[PDB]
Amino acid sequence: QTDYRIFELNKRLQNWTEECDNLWWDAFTTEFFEDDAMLTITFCLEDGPKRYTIGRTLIPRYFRSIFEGGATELYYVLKHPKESFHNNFVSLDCDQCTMVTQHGKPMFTQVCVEGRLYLEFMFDDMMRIKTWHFSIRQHRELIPRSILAMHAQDPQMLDQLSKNITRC
Amino acid sequence: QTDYRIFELNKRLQNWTEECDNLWWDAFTTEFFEDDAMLTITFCLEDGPKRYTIGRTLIPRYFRSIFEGGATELYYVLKHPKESFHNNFVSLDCDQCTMVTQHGKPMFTQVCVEGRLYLEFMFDDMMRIKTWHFSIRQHRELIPRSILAMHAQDPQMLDQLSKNITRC
Amino acid sequence: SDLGKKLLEAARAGQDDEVRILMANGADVNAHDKRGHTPLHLAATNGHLEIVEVLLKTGADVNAYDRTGVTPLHLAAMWGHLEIVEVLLKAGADVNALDMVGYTPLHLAAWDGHLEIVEVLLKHGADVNAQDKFGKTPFDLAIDNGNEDIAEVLQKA
Amino acid sequence: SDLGKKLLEAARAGQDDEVRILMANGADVNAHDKRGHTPLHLAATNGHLEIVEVLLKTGADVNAYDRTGVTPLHLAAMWGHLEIVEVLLKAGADVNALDMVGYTPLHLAAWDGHLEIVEVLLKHGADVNAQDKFGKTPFDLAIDNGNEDIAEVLQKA
């Protein structure tokens, strides 16, 4: 069951703290990705082209970067994914994937990046990701209702709270 | 593994639409709860006492109500749950549980209700919930940043957007 | 058996014409699934009034209880189905029937929060003092689920 | 073997005093785990400069490659460790070393976005034209990861 694997992946990401060393990202990538894995990210078509394609040595460095932003929380929500079987591997095509990060201590913004995630997994004991393609449609940012109460009467501070803190 | 069971529970809740009949809630409760299950909710101690305790016949009616609000999305996020084993059953104590609902088409608010969730599960093939106790600490509401851009210059509309739409 | 199932399906989906074809082809109207749900349980939960009436008319047991001791009147009351509550009482449904938890219809209506459904049950002699497994009364349940209109009423009997 | 492991552990946790006790108790400084990581790989990833220097001094292989063909200089460059990049080049680390993907240190630094690390590699004769498995150059990677300073520089060679 592929769906268990992305649950286990979200579960591992819970153990991340500022206190974790760079080699934690390697052990994480070894548990969930193949040694020859490939990872593609296609960014919002409201911007220019933008398209990561990276192999295994850079995958630890990719995930680390998600928490360089101020993100202290990361999980992937898969609504109605299609599992298909083939000779060497299983595909998981999820048209309704949301990448959720929460910024700040305390939380001051949640970022939802919605797109299609396609995974191929090795069909062996380990069930590790051969291929990762996330083509993003859109991103929205949510802020606590409390922050709006606070700055009701501050046109300038409301003008700044209006602005996205990420690009996608 | 108890953690798989709450993944499967969040996964089932994805299939809910306004188009689903009341008996869907019974089939859902049969898959995840025992025939003699018990469900307790302790509400925010900022309000009065407030404390559901209900048996199996009302559990379908409880879950349905979460979507009577305008909620079109429900999942439980379990950060660092403790699995313990006993004679008849497994406990799962999660001090960092968040009940996430999203209101509206389109989404105009996300509601996070944070508390301790304690589960007991039957240790059999079915692994169904004997007991469900969620004692809530707090709830916060998040709104799209876009809504704030929109109503920047409307003191009255910002005064209304300031107000919680739920109680917990 | 075979027909048994199609008639649970049709009773669920509120398929009026398909309930008639089956009843005419000899379907058992007191047929039950693994839960102990009858067509009457199903139709009473999904609010299918006409199917309730026609099942009751062909000998469907008004007081049939599932494995949890739950009757159609329990279900009609819990899901807030006024007309079905009225039709079931008139066919003799037990107004103070107890499930495995000690819930009565009144308990379930006290929860659901249907103002008229409570009064019809009270008119038909529902026990205002009935205690569920947790020592809770219809009164209590209406405080719990924040139905303060219903509780005013229940403070009277 | 036994000591082999403790020395990977200590090299990881940047435990300077515990690397000395082990080296004095005969720990193999070219010891490797299942991945093919050496103390040097580990210390170079977690930024432990003093351990890098002392391993290099006791015969640690500067150019040891893990199962994916990855060298300490690859890792120092990727994780943005200036002083460790300088020390490794001086101990003879291959500046144009290729992993399984066709990544060079320059590719990885082009990604990480460390302005000085790129110039030190370019000074030490890094191939500006090197193509990874996907036909991407350090230049390309710096556009991809939005490091436009680094790309200005790479447009020169």
Author numbering:
A (entry chain A), B (entry chain A): 30 to 197
C (entry chain F), D (entry chain F): 38 to 194
Paper lines:
The Chip/LIM-domain binding protein (LDB)–single-stranded DNA-binding protein (SSDP) (ChiLS) complex controls numerous cell-fate decisions in animal cells, by mediating transcription of developmental control genes via remote enhancers. Chip/LDB and SSDP both contain N-terminal dimerization domains that constitute the bulk of their structured cores. We recently discovered that Chip/LDB and SSDP form a stable complex called ChiLS (Chip/LDB-SSDP), which binds to NPFxD motifs within the nuclear Wnt signaling factor Pygopus (Pygo) and Osa/ARID1A, a chromatin-binding subunit of the BAF transcriptional coactivator complex. Here, we report the crystal structures of the DD of SSDP and XLdb1, in the latter case with the help of DARPin (designed ankyrin repeat proteins) chaperones that mask a hydrophobic surface patch of the DD required for its SSDP binding.
